């Protein structure tokens, strides 16, 4: 009833990016500069199908420094975990919810098994939970 | 003599991203959120090994627009694309270097033979005139 570490997720498909500024309602612990990645079953239902067993997307977050009208990426922050399981995963809507600091894996971040996770991505239940769409 | 389009580069390895805004020097046309991708022979050069022929490195620009203290993904601006041949591209260090507006293979934007891009990645000649770092 653990969601898996991602290894490896740095070599998958790069969904989208965002940055999140000081202000916004998810700035604690949201802020800075996000990317999305989505491994090859990920991939199947960003493009329209059913998620499959074994779907991960991974958020990752960085610091950033602004510098000179730029915002450089600095030290990773934590990354943010989603993994496809309909029936280990049952009570929080078919997907495991973990964060781990800095993306170590021994360091867990969620306490509540997922639910205030969940909660927020219940919202997106059309989409199968998964606020991000894909782009070309 | 010319830069081929990186058909698939979006499927490519995220090296980086960088957010550049009005008021840095190189606003126009580089103002936007840009993500590095990189093929398996970039890869190796990145890595501490020589850039392998057929090296291709692309820069994806995308517009931003500010929603509630974010920087949002808009439409893609342009790639610019260094392709790796020692020979060929020798009169700009071994790289070609094409853009193509809005990432479309039919809008080629360089008309000097890449001359103006080259002159601005020789300053970075002692990593082979790349600029990105590779990163966890
Ligand atoms: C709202 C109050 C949220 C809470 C609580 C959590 N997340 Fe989040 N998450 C949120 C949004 C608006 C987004 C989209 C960002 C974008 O760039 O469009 C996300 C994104 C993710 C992702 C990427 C997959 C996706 O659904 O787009 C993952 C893997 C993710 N979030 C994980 C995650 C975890 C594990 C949470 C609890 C620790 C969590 N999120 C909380 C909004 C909100
Ligand atoms: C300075 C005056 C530049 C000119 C002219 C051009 N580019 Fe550029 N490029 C520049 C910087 C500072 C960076 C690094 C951005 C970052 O996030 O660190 C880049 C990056 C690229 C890349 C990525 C590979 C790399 O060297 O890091 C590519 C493929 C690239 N640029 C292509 C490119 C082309 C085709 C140009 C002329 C049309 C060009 N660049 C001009 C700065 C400058
Ligand atoms: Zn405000």
Same mark, same amino acid.
């Given at each position: ?8 997720? *740095?070599?998958?498909?790069? @969904?989208?990016? &965002? ?8 700035? /604690? ?7 999305? $990645?989505? /491994? ?9 199908? /059913? $998620?499959?067993?074994?779907? @991960? ?5 960085? %610091?950033?420094?602004?510098? /000179? ?12 975990? &989603?993994?496809? %399981?309909?029936? *280990? ?7 495991? $919810?973990?964060?781990? =600091? ?9 306490? %509540?098994?997922?639910? =205030? ?11 199968? $939970?998964?606020?991000? *769409?894909? *782009? %070309?």
């Amino acid at each position: 009833t653990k969601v898996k570490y991602p290894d490896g997720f *740095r070599s998958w498909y790069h @969904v989208k990016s &965002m940055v999140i500024q000081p202000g916004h309602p998810l700035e /604690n612990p949201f802020g800075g500069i996000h990317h999305v $990645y989505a /491994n090859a079953e990920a991939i199947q239902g960003l493009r329209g199908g /059913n $998620y499959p067993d074994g779907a @991960v997307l991974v958020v990752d977050l960085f %610091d950033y420094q602004e510098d /000179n009208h730029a915002l450089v990426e600095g030290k990773r922050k934590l990354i943010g975990v &989603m993994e496809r %399981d309909a029936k *280990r995963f049952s009570a929080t809507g078919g997907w495991g $919810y973990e964060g781990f =600091g800095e993306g170590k894996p021994d360091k867990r971040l969620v306490t %509540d098994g997922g639910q =205030g996770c969940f909660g927020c991505h219940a919202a997106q239940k059309e989409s199968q $939970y998964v606020f991000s *769409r894909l *782009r %070309d």
